[PDB]
Symmetry: C2
Subunit: 32 residues, 2 copies
């Protein structure tokens, strides 16, 4: 899958597929 751990909302044509934990902060996992 092609995904990004985003500080903000998922982009156009992405879906929220889960979350990322990076260095004590939570991120959206946005995938397309």
């Amino acid at each position: 899958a092609t995904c990004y751990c985003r500080t903000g909302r998922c982009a156009t044509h992405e879906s929220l597929s889960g979350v990322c934990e990076i260095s004590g902060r939570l991120y959206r996992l946005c995938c397309r």
Copy 2:
């Protein structure tokens, strides 16, 4: 960043960078 949420270990050239949670399972976040 170009990262993958992997079921297995990170590749030799990748850097373990965090954790993905997707549909009730945890995955390594492995980044180029």
